[PDB]
Design an enzyme around this catalytic site. Structure first.
Site, PDB file in Angstrom:
ATOM      1  N   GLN D 124      10.852   5.403  -1.986  1.00 29.09           N
ATOM      2  CA  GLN D 124      10.841   4.128  -2.690  1.00 29.09           C
ATOM      3  C   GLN D 124      12.098   3.368  -2.349  1.00 29.09           C
ATOM      4  O   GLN D 124      13.224   3.910  -2.388  1.00 29.09           O
ATOM      5  CB  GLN D 124      10.704   4.349  -4.199  1.00 29.09           C
ATOM      6  CG  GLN D 124      10.803   3.047  -5.021  1.00 29.09           C
ATOM      7  CD  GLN D 124      12.225   2.677  -5.368  1.00 29.09           C
ATOM      8  OE1 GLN D 124      13.139   3.528  -5.344  1.00 29.09           O
ATOM      9  NE2 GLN D 124      12.447   1.413  -5.692  1.00 29.09           N
ATOM     10  N   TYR D 126      14.497  -0.067  -2.969  1.00 24.33           N
ATOM     11  CA  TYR D 126      14.953  -1.314  -3.562  1.00 24.33           C
ATOM     12  C   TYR D 126      15.720  -2.107  -2.517  1.00 24.33           C
ATOM     13  O   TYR D 126      16.461  -1.539  -1.694  1.00 24.33           O
ATOM     14  CB  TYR D 126      15.875  -1.035  -4.724  1.00 24.33           C
ATOM     15  CG  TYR D 126      15.201  -0.730  -6.044  1.00 24.33           C
ATOM     16  CD1 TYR D 126      14.193  -1.556  -6.550  1.00 24.33           C
ATOM     17  CD2 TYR D 126      15.592   0.366  -6.812  1.00 24.33           C
ATOM     18  CE1 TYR D 126      13.605  -1.295  -7.780  1.00 24.33           C
ATOM     19  CE2 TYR D 126      15.022   0.631  -8.038  1.00 24.33           C
ATOM     20  CZ  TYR D 126      14.026  -0.204  -8.524  1.00 24.33           C
ATOM     21  OH  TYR D 126      13.455   0.063  -9.745  1.00 24.33           O
ATOM     22  N   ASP D 154       8.825  -5.819  -7.711  1.00 31.53           N
ATOM     23  CA  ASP D 154       8.794  -6.436  -9.048  1.00 31.53           C
ATOM     24  C   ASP D 154      10.109  -6.363  -9.821  1.00 31.53           C
ATOM     25  O   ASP D 154      10.140  -6.622 -11.027  1.00 31.53           O
ATOM     26  CB  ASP D 154       7.591  -5.963  -9.915  1.00 31.53           C
ATOM     27  CG  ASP D 154       7.563  -4.455 -10.180  1.00 31.53           C
ATOM     28  OD1 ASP D 154       8.509  -3.749  -9.767  1.00 31.53           O
ATOM     29  OD2 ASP D 154       6.585  -3.999 -10.813  1.00 31.53           O
ATOM     30  N   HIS D 250       4.990  -2.147 -13.663  1.00 27.69           N
ATOM     31  CA  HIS D 250       6.210  -1.343 -13.770  1.00 27.69           C
ATOM     32  C   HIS D 250       6.308  -0.691 -15.146  1.00 27.69           C
ATOM     33  O   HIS D 250       7.385  -0.668 -15.760  1.00 27.69           O
ATOM     34  CB  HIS D 250       7.432  -2.226 -13.489  1.00 27.69           C
ATOM     35  CG  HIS D 250       8.610  -1.499 -12.907  1.00 27.69           C
ATOM     36  ND1 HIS D 250       8.985  -1.631 -11.585  1.00 27.69           N
ATOM     37  CD2 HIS D 250       9.548  -0.722 -13.488  1.00 27.69           C
ATOM     38  CE1 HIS D 250      10.084  -0.934 -11.363  1.00 27.69           C
ATOM     39  NE2 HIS D 250      10.447  -0.375 -12.502  1.00 27.69           N
ATOM     40  N   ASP D 281      -0.925   2.030 -11.275  1.00 28.67           N
ATOM     41  CA  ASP D 281      -0.229   2.876 -12.253  1.00 28.67           C
ATOM     42  C   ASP D 281      -0.111   2.180 -13.588  1.00 28.67           C
ATOM     43  O   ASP D 281      -0.581   1.035 -13.756  1.00 28.67           O
ATOM     44  CB  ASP D 281       1.126   3.406 -11.749  1.00 28.67           C
ATOM     45  CG  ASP D 281       2.218   2.358 -11.675  1.00 28.67           C
ATOM     46  OD1 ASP D 281       2.071   1.240 -12.241  1.00 28.67           O
ATOM     47  OD2 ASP D 281       3.251   2.682 -11.059  1.00 28.67           O
ATOM     48  N   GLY D 282       0.469   2.879 -14.552  1.00 29.91           N
ATOM     49  CA  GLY D 282       0.664   2.351 -15.887  1.00 29.91           C
ATOM     50  C   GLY D 282      -0.235   3.049 -16.876  1.00 29.91           C
ATOM     51  O   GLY D 282      -1.423   2.770 -16.926  1.00 29.91           O
ATOM     52  N   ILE D 284      -1.516   6.152 -17.079  1.00 27.86           N
ATOM     53  CA  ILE D 284      -2.444   7.215 -16.713  1.00 27.86           C
ATOM     54  C   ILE D 284      -2.002   8.492 -17.459  1.00 27.86           C
ATOM     55  O   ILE D 284      -0.879   8.968 -17.233  1.00 27.86           O
ATOM     56  CB  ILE D 284      -2.438   7.481 -15.202  1.00 27.86           C
ATOM     57  CG1 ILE D 284      -2.864   6.236 -14.412  1.00 27.86           C
ATOM     58  CG2 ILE D 284      -3.352   8.654 -14.871  1.00 27.86           C
ATOM     59  CD1 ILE D 284      -4.308   5.752 -14.662  1.00 27.86           C
ATOM     60  N   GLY D 304       4.069   8.383 -13.992  1.00 31.01           N
ATOM     61  CA  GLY D 304       5.509   8.302 -14.143  1.00 31.01           C
ATOM     62  C   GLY D 304       5.988   9.099 -15.335  1.00 31.01           C
ATOM     63  O   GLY D 304       6.390  10.284 -15.206  1.00 31.01           O
TER      64      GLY D 304
HETATM   65  C1  LIG Z   1      12.635   6.073 -16.443  1.00 32.02           C
HETATM   66  C2  LIG Z   1      11.865   5.291 -15.397  1.00 32.02           C
HETATM   67  C3  LIG Z   1      12.454   5.023 -14.175  1.00 32.02           C
HETATM   68  C4  LIG Z   1      11.759   4.317 -13.200  1.00 32.02           C
HETATM   69  N1  LIG Z   1      12.349   4.080 -11.972  1.00 32.02           N
HETATM   70  C5  LIG Z   1      11.663   3.371 -11.014  1.00 32.02           C
HETATM   71  C6  LIG Z   1      12.218   3.114  -9.766  1.00 32.02           C
HETATM   72  O1  LIG Z   1      13.374   3.513  -9.466  1.00 32.02           O
HETATM   73  N2  LIG Z   1      11.487   2.417  -8.836  1.00 32.02           N
HETATM   74  C7  LIG Z   1      10.212   1.966  -9.129  1.00 32.02           C
HETATM   75  O2  LIG Z   1       9.575   1.335  -8.281  1.00 32.02           O
HETATM   76  N3  LIG Z   1       9.675   2.228 -10.350  1.00 32.02           N
HETATM   77  C8  LIG Z   1      10.369   2.919 -11.298  1.00 32.02           C
HETATM   78  N4  LIG Z   1       9.769   3.181 -12.496  1.00 32.02           N
HETATM   79  C9  LIG Z   1       8.362   2.691 -12.741  1.00 32.02           C
HETATM   80  C10 LIG Z   1       7.332   3.788 -12.424  1.00 32.02           C
HETATM   81  O3  LIG Z   1       7.323   4.065 -11.040  1.00 32.02           O
HETATM   82  C11 LIG Z   1       5.915   3.424 -12.912  1.00 32.02           C
HETATM   83  O4  LIG Z   1       5.545   2.188 -12.309  1.00 32.02           O
HETATM   84  C12 LIG Z   1       5.859   3.254 -14.426  1.00 32.02           C
HETATM   85  O5  LIG Z   1       6.602   4.291 -15.069  1.00 32.02           O
HETATM   86  C13 LIG Z   1       4.461   3.146 -15.041  1.00 32.02           C
HETATM   87  O6  LIG Z   1       3.793   4.379 -15.046  1.00 32.02           O
HETATM   88  P1  LIG Z   1       3.696   5.362 -16.372  1.00 32.02           P
HETATM   89  O7  LIG Z   1       3.017   4.682 -17.515  1.00 32.02           O
HETATM   90  O8  LIG Z   1       2.919   6.516 -15.834  1.00 32.02           O
HETATM   91  O9  LIG Z   1       5.104   5.717 -16.776  1.00 32.02           O
HETATM   92  C14 LIG Z   1      10.458   3.872 -13.479  1.00 32.02           C
HETATM   93  C15 LIG Z   1       9.862   4.160 -14.698  1.00 32.02           C
HETATM   94  C16 LIG Z   1      10.566   4.863 -15.667  1.00 32.02           C
HETATM   95  C17 LIG Z   1       9.923   5.165 -16.985  1.00 32.02           C
HETATM   96  F   LIG Z   2      15.292   1.840 -11.062  1.00 30.86           F
END
Ligand SMILES: Cc1cc2nc3c(=O)[nH]c(=O)nc-3n(C[C@H](O)[C@H](O)[C@H](O)COP(=O)(O)O)c2cc1C
Ligand SMILES: [F-]
Ligand SMILES: Cc1cc2nc3c(=O)[nH]c(=O)nc-3n(C[C@H](O)[C@H](O)[C@H](O)COP(=O)(O)O)c2cc1C
Ligand SMILES: Cc1cc2nc3c(=O)[nH]c(=O)nc-3n(C[C@H](O)[C@H](O)[C@H](O)COP(=O)(O)O)c2cc1C
Ligand SMILES: Cc1cc2nc3c(=O)[nH]c(=O)nc-3n(C[C@H](O)[C@H](O)[C@H](O)COP(=O)(O)O)c2cc1C
Ligand SMILES: [F-]
Ligand SMILES: [F-]
Ligand SMILES: [F-]
Lengths: 354, 354, 354, 354
Positions: D124, D126, D154, D250, D281-282, D284, D304
């Protein structure tokens, strides 16, 4: 404070019960008050990604002036109810934030004093039983440097606010209508009766399209009709020469069961097709809500109750903090949604959810 | 009292539990009872602004008489259950308010006595096992000065009201059907059984279109069919010579799962296309609700339970206060919505919300 | 008892916790279990008025027999879990009520014994790893006088029932599969594991369209496919020679997130266009619910859990009381909706509400 | 553990409050966070019956590798926040389960160390203020054997997470960004401020379509754009040469009020019409949710928060158990829905419910 909700909590702490109720409440069963919030909560934004955000600007041009945000302070009568500095505190904060402030017909400090604060203010008009008095207020507002006339068209009389009736609400002796001798009716305590509603039923006359034309003929300032909900009334407002409308159910305080402005906004924007500015109010409680209103097509929003929460909580400084928070939330929401300008935000799409 | 809800609270205080339950309850799981309220709460009015309100009038002409409001008191059997003056108290208040009062087949004071109160009353008809008795009631009603026959068509027998069954509800000895010898069945106490339901299953015959024609041939008065929900039944009612219909699920007391009248009203109004008056009932609890019904196309509404709350709470004076409150709320809602007449209110648009 | 809900309360009182959970529960988060109820609650009937009700009949003809109601007892395995007389108590009550009873492959009393009760029974088939055993059950059922084969097609294996897993549910020693030697797997206690799910994963084979043809070739009885939800599977069932289908998500016990049968029923009825009987189950809890299913086009419904509540509460007498209550509620709902026959009820219209 | 919900309970027990909040929370009022769940709960699957299930396989081919499930571990920064073994524990479990693991730009163990675990990982990205650093990370990831670049589009800056602000959240001294010297900003404690948000506002640059092209030119690996919600952005991603997109808000942590990815997924799948992989995602939280996403057209999902719950609860073993549970739930749901392959699941139909 990290959200506007923080401010409501602060305001409930400090204000006397009947004053908080006068501020918070709506008419009837408060269906329209709740619906203003529900309606916003159902709207979801479809954000754009990967756009240039090197100079995000939240500014708009409206009624001939640049404003710092697509937002103005809504007209709220009798601001000394909430803090001793009343309208002066709010107007100073609005000026400093670059946000238009709407001076009320029923302001508790004279319109000339509030205008003297600066910040290119608007003036809200109620149509009074003596027509000449209303037209004199328009001329006073223009002479004092107000830049728009916000003609409230949804108060032929005040709605039935059961909280105010149950409380037997009346204005304290130290709060008065500073723009004219409004008599003593709003100060009279009567059980089960709202003195403010009794007062206005005597003082106000129902406005008509003829009243709008009388105002339009009396001033060179843009006339903005506040309280439009029907599509045909929005069209007619344009035909009547209005420079803008505020799509609004008056915060759920007038007809209980009136549709939220946010529910009519898209249809209204399509029907007027750029013929006037289209503002909306009712339940705007964050920068994300501003974004939703913009995405539905609004030129700008008004914010009412939260400005009074901030004023009650911490006076001028409180209003400053509220506006700084809203400014940050608007910039944040716009950028996250891929919008470098308010015009770009107006081109966002939305989706209803549950 | 500042709302009808105030009156329900007052009535619950005073009435015996099983009588409040008989009044409040519905059939089955009370789904249709709740849905009557839900259905109204989902309707929002799109008010008009800037119209002439110099002579707002809430009056209508219906069945040859001017009524003060687009409202009548619904038929409610056995009013002596709620106050010793029963139907006489309610009829006097209705007369004084200029509102039609519906005298019931199962009134606890004779129809001639109630008619003698004045106020140009209507008469509600149940079809009885002995047809001649039902037709005799029609002739008695006409001879006594009733101005319409409200033929209830949704009670081939009484629905299953679980509150009444659990309570083993029966009429007190001091309450009887004053219009005829109805026997003793409704007074018999049996565990897990509603005596009122047992009584009517014996006394009532299912009405048919043939029964409607028999009534229409027996009187010059307008015949109004109460309990129509299907569009095709509304059309057929017009073809059958009905002067009106009441779109109604009988307050959620008959078929549990029957659609609310308010949900069928717009479609029914379109289908009859002015061929008869179209009334609605079920859950009307404010002037704003009256406005919603009017905006959906109703000629008038009926109000049932709240009139009994008022009667239980304070007798004739209570009903007077209820009607004065409703009158004020109707005038208020109409004006706030830009309507100087009930006809204008019928031309309002609505929007469903959540 | 005045409602089926009374019986659930009675059953919760008497049954051991893990057995009530096995009965009440669903798979996963129980979304589909809840949705079965939600889906029915959203349907409202548009009743008809003024029709002849001189001989209301709730009878239907289905699979060559007259049934007293448009209802059958759903297949429920292992009825001795709920009362010592198990399937015999339920079958006797069903016979006496004129309602078809479905004998299960996993009955705790042999299919021949239950058939000997009389009442022209149906037989539910699971496809087993040894195909010959399943076909032998079909022949046994036919030889014993069963009148239809209800082939369950939605259990290639048992769903994940978290209540059963958390309870470490297993059959008591005194409950067995009486139709064949099913081994000991369903009786084995293992922490965090459902022995019943473990047992069936070993014993059951996934059924296919080929299995349906093998069954259809093995018997002259109508084959009814239970657990159809896709429109195309309903069409294919007709093409395959099925005499009926049961539109069903297996009480929310199989795929969590499977659509309720009641949500697919109308579309399925249209697609098969009279080519087979279309039954529905899931959450039928009153005569009004039967009416809703009929109005959506069902030939008949199955009822599962409430029959077990009645059995647990009061054995054969309990089931009798449940069926008498349902019969009364069906007759009541039909008449209130203007339907003298089940065919008339199928022609009722419905409206979704909130 | 028999459900993912079991793991959240376990994680709340063990983690410090501010860390659980950082993990659980969303931006603003958490409307989008809640909506991710609501949106899935409204989707119902229409399962198919009677299909061959003799070799159900949950495998997919994506970005040139076979994966054991249509699922990957979402990028989650700073995994040492949740367990001392952090990313190494999660990557080992993912490898053993045959599930792709996404290594983060802000990983707390270096990307080369995590890649050395094996299991064909993704990386991943940034976009950073110093572009060369971001491109160097891409080259490092490719050199280390990562198989895709997941470019997060995003996060021009971090959203406003009120829990983190109220907590004055900052990283513990023992957690750092191991891939580069990120400075000390994320470790600085300031009242009412999120140090992590302050840090990234300084470190991150908004990405644009030009940034995407720079990445695409710098690597032969498939570039996957994570955080696409607008249909037109999905189309543009294909035109830009993306190998995939992740339809995502996200986790409700960026724009509060952003539509859930699951609500845009079907429209996006139709618009790209096989031109790239479409992940979602989101929210699941089960194999049934995976099935819903697949049925709406997703190639695969990311998960996530639940992976972090498992990591916090029991380290590598916890993640193993979570993935084994998800694998079983996916196989279960697919089979119950009549799908022997993920391609068959993508052809399932769905229905919205309430
Ligand atoms: C603690 C935390 C850290 C995250 N860090 C990143 C990240 O570094 N880069 C990214 O693209 N998404 C990041 N995400 C977003 C996740 O990749 C994912 O899109 C999001 O958690 C939604 O899925 P979930 O409902 O299964 O948690 C993060 C999410 C959480 C909760
Ligand atoms: F992050
Ligand atoms: C205490 C109070 C006083 C108000 N006074 C006026 C007024 O004098 N003129 C007017 O047009 N609107 C008045 N309004 C309505 C507001 O301008 C605005 O339409 C409404 O408050 C809805 O916005 P909100 O939800 O942000 O409060 C008042 C509202 C409140 C709460
Ligand atoms: C206690 C009670 C008695 C009623 N008696 C009759 C009756 O005799 N005839 C009739 O047509 N409707 C009768 N109704 C139905 C009402 O006329 C009306 O349709 C219903 O109450 C719904 O209106 P509401 O919600 O305002 O109560 C009765 C209702 C109640 C609550
Ligand atoms: C305890 C229990 C056992 C069941 N056993 C079977 C069975 O052996 N075969 C079958 O096809 N369905 C079985 N079912 C499903 C029912 O036949 C029916 O589809 C389901 O219970 C939904 O109806 P309800 O809501 O009325 O309970 C069972 C259901 C329950 C609750
Ligand atoms: F005001
Ligand atoms: F009655
Ligand atoms: F079973």
């Amino acid at each position: 404070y990290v959200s506007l909700a923080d401010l409501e909590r602060a305001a409930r702490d400090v204000l006397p019960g009947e004053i908080f109720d006068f501020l918070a409440g709506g008419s009837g069963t408060e269906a329209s008050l709740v619906a203003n919030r529900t309606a916003l909560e159902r709207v979801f934004v479809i954000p754009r990604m990967l756009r240039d955000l090197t100079d995000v600007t939240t500014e708009i041009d409206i009624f001939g002036r640049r404003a710092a945000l697509p937002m103005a302070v809504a007209p709220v009568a009798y601001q000394r109810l909430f803090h001793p500095e009343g309208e002066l505190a709010v107007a100073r904060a609005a000026r400093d934030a670059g946000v238009p402030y709407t001076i009320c017909t029923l302001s508790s400090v004279s319109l000339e004093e509030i205008a003297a604060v600066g910040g290119r203010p608007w003036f809200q008009l109620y149509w009074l039983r003596d027509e000449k008095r209303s037209l004199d207020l328009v001329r006073r507002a223009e002479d004092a440097g107000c830049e728009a006339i916000v003609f409230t068209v949804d108060v032929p009389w005040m709605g039935r606010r059961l909280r105010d009736m149950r409380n037997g609400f009346a204005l304290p002796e130290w709060v008065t209508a500073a723009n004219f001798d409004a008599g003593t009716a709003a100060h009279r305590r009567t059980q089960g009766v709202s003195a403010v509603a009794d007062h206005t039923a005597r003082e106000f006359a129902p406005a008509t399209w003829e009243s709008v034309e009388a105002v339009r003929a009396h001033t060179d300032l843009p006339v903005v009709l506040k309280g439009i909900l029907a599509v045909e009334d929005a069209r007619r407002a344009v035909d009547a020469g209005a420079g803008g409308i505020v799509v609004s159910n008056h915060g759920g305080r007038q007809l209980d069961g009136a549709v939220p402005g946010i529910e009519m906004l898209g249809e209204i924007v399509a029907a007027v097709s750029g013929g006037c500015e289209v503002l909306v109010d009712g339940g705007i409680r964050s920068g994300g809500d501003v974004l939703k209103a913009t995405a539905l097509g609004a030129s700008a929003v008004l914010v009412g109750r939260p400005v009074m929460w901030a004023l009650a909580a911490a006076g001028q400084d409180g209003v400053r903090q509220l506006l700084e928070l809203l400014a940050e939330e608007v910039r944040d929401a716009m950028g996250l949604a891929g919008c470098e300008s308010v015009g770009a935000a107006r081109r966002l799409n939305t989706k209803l959810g549950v």
